Enzyme design. Sequence first.
Site, short mmCIF file in Angstrom:
data_model
loop_
_atom_site.label_atom_id
_atom_site.label_comp_id
_atom_site.label_asym_id
_atom_site.label_seq_id
_atom_site.Cartn_x
_atom_site.Cartn_y
_atom_site.Cartn_z
N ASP B 48 -3.28 24.39 -16.26
CA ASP B 48 -2.79 23.53 -15.21
C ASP B 48 -1.85 24.20 -14.19
OD1 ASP B 48 -3.75 20.64 -14.98
OD2 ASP B 48 -1.67 20.56 -14.30
N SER B 99 -4.23 16.98 -9.32
CA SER B 99 -4.98 17.22 -10.54
C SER B 99 -6.12 16.20 -10.71
CB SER B 99 -4.13 17.13 -11.78
OG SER B 99 -2.87 17.74 -11.53
N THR B 152 -6.31 15.59 -16.02
CA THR B 152 -7.29 16.52 -16.58
C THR B 152 -8.10 15.99 -17.78
OG1 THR B 152 -5.98 18.40 -15.75
CG2 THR B 152 -7.65 18.88 -17.34
N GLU B 319 -6.97 22.10 -22.39
CA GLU B 319 -5.99 22.23 -21.30
C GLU B 319 -4.62 22.65 -21.67
OE1 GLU B 319 -4.49 18.78 -19.44
OE2 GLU B 319 -3.95 19.72 -17.59
N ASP B 324 1.99 23.49 -15.08
CA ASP B 324 2.32 22.93 -13.75
C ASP B 324 3.47 21.91 -13.76
OD1 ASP B 324 1.12 20.13 -14.07
OD2 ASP B 324 0.63 20.25 -11.94
N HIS B 367 -5.82 23.46 -9.65
CA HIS B 367 -5.39 23.83 -8.26
C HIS B 367 -4.24 24.82 -8.41
CE1 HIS B 367 -2.01 21.44 -9.31
NE2 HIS B 367 -2.85 20.48 -9.68
#
Lengths: 446, 446
Positions: B48, B99, B152, B319, B324, B367
């Site tokens: 992330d 996200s 996510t 994940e 992030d 991202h």
Amino acid sequence: MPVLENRAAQGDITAPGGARRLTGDQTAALRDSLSDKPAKNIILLIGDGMGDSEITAARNYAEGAGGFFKGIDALPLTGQYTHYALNKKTGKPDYVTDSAASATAWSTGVKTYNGALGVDIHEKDHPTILEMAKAAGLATGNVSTAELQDATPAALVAHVTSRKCYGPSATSEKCPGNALEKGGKGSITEQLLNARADVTLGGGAKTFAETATAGEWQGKTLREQAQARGYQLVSDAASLNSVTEANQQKPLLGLFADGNMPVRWLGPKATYHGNIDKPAVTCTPNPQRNDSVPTLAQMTDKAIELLSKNEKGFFLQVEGASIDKQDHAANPCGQIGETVDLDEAVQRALEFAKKEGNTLVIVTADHAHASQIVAPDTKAPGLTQALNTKDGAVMVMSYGNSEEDSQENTGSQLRIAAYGPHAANVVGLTDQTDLFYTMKAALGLK
Amino acid sequence: MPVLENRAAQGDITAPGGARRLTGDQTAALRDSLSDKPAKNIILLIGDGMGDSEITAARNYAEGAGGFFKGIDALPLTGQYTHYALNKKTGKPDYVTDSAASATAWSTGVKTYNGALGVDIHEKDHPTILEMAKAAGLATGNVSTAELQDATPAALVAHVTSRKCYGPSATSEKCPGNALEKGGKGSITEQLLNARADVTLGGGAKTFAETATAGEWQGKTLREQAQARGYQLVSDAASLNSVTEANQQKPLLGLFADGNMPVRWLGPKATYHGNIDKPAVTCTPNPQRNDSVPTLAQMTDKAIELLSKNEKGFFLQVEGASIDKQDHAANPCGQIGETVDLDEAVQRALEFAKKEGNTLVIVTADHAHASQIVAPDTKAPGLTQALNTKDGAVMVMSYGNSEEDSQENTGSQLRIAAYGPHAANVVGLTDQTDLFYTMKAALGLK
Ligand SMILES: [Mg+2]
Ligand SMILES: [Mg+2]
Ligand SMILES: [Zn+2]
Ligand SMILES: [Zn+2]
């Protein structure tokens, strides 16, 4: 060996599969991109401070988010490389390099301290890829939109303890050990005259006005020395087109500006809360760019034309320079326009490589920069600007890594892309020093 | 198909060739990495906000500049992909995505507006790669260190107009059209229960405490409904290890936290001029991460063990989430520590794939983020912190894209790397929606 003809969004971005850039499986096309055969020529295109963010910003602006740079984005083999420098005293890594150390890393294969050109932490000289290429009988070209004495183009032909030693004056103060009058090899410009590449094109005409403090041409200006050494001086596009031969007997030297060549696009500087306070900007072509001034693409084209006559092959380095200067100056338009400039150059190089079949083309940057593409309603601590993209939408750019105006460089690993024999050596994680070894080997230099 | 065993600096960084990561020509190894044969399994690892910069900072800190992440960096086929979103109203690109929209783009193949989950700009649902896999009979896994209702992991099993519709409460307010009670398909959590993946592991236990406003289980807590539906509930490592089977009849559901699972490393928040005013930070292990709490690696290992039993194959999404969140919180240590976590997971995945031979492993981010590696003497306008790297040197991190604490996301294109059948489809420039098509095709979903 195929080039990516088109990797733009295949259709309606809003629709399922419309945003796709692929139309089918790539395994086959990649297999056709792998070749370990020798590279006869090498064309290395360096975008100054053009890391992934800068590339994304220039594409969004000029081609749209689902756009595709026909040059920059058309290279099939891609990867990311590290470019950390060394601390001169400790020898430990210095996570954020400058243009000088990075240029040295790929041009000689050895890491160095920030500010050094062609020497290691012990100030020992190490031969560059150009010198090596020249020594093997290949033709050599050094093309740039910056001043020929600047780190990138200078690194191929100079060996000095500080990048500031442009001419005699600065050298005596900053590089006494390289100072001609002190028995040293000379300033950047003097060493450039000595290196005698077949084709050198750029700005930096100013320093050629200085007079040598010593040697045969003591008392003469570096300009006068060049003529006397046998060089063909050209100062404009017309005279450049007139050139038909460039060789060791008649080396070419194009000085098209006192300093850096004119920027492609004009636009205002980024400012505090500029995306909020000021209106969206639309870049505009610089009137002073001139039909007199050759563009990076034209110089690249002329360079390939001349270097091409050498049966043994050639090595050509091309630099889209004003990019990071405009990045430092927090000027979106200048920065983006310099990336478009480069892209045109990469296209000319790719066309030639494609038809020639034995040319390795590499496009990358020396280090990363400060630019970040942020949400449009962003209230950032630094400088910002809103831009009107080809998509008819707004893109906001931020420069928030320095308070002292000049937006500093960063240490992020960045994209390296290539096409041709040995391009497979840029895929995955590599080091900028690997690049020296890849070109050396591809070219069979020994 | 080889994995890069070692791309660390070959020797003495200060010496010629000492910083090289390559030991020879890669053409042949690359040729052995190319295969269009079918992928039996797919393991997708998402870091992330893990763009190139985050990866470079986490390497410099944990492995040293000339270091090498055994997992993250070992993938041979690499490229860069765009992840722009669309403006709901105009349908034009929105250069910086969240996200939710990015997750939806790779999970369904269609671009959407920021905040959406499993729906296009028109709020129309589109089937996710997990739903499709499950429908084809493959086993499915959804693992994350975040809350299972977060963008996510949620994107694979939910279809809502707003990522905020966690449970019944929020859904009625934020997503009346998805609200169960209003004839909608239900909140993120409810839809997750409905989707029934074989293995779902993560945090977010808090929302399972809500009660259904309607349906069969109206009046029952989502936790109660899960039990009643046939799920195996696990809340700690020990019980997780006890699980021997996970299937459609006995789907597994591991809730190891009320919200996000514990961060690996603790450290102070970045601050104004912190690289100048404050001393260099050395990150410290979080004591509350617990031997009771399974690590992302462990969850990845257990999930591969169970999903493995399905003869038809499996699809697993993993994940490394807190990255992030810590990047937003401008907390270098949390951020970096989350990247190390992921690396261990990628390793586990890569070992299995290497041995199995028909598994496509893909590592990438949703991202980009704010983090930038800047010179140590930097006087930046935002938050900064100096860290003590493995190299025994200092690295400075800067977060300067937002004034409102939470460091925003950015739109730079970032790295996507893969290994196995069809990995060639991530090389060069691609779009995040191409990722959906690559997985669907590799897996032969139809
Ligand atoms: Mg430069
Ligand atoms: Mg997320
Ligand atoms: Zn630079
Ligand atoms: Zn994210």
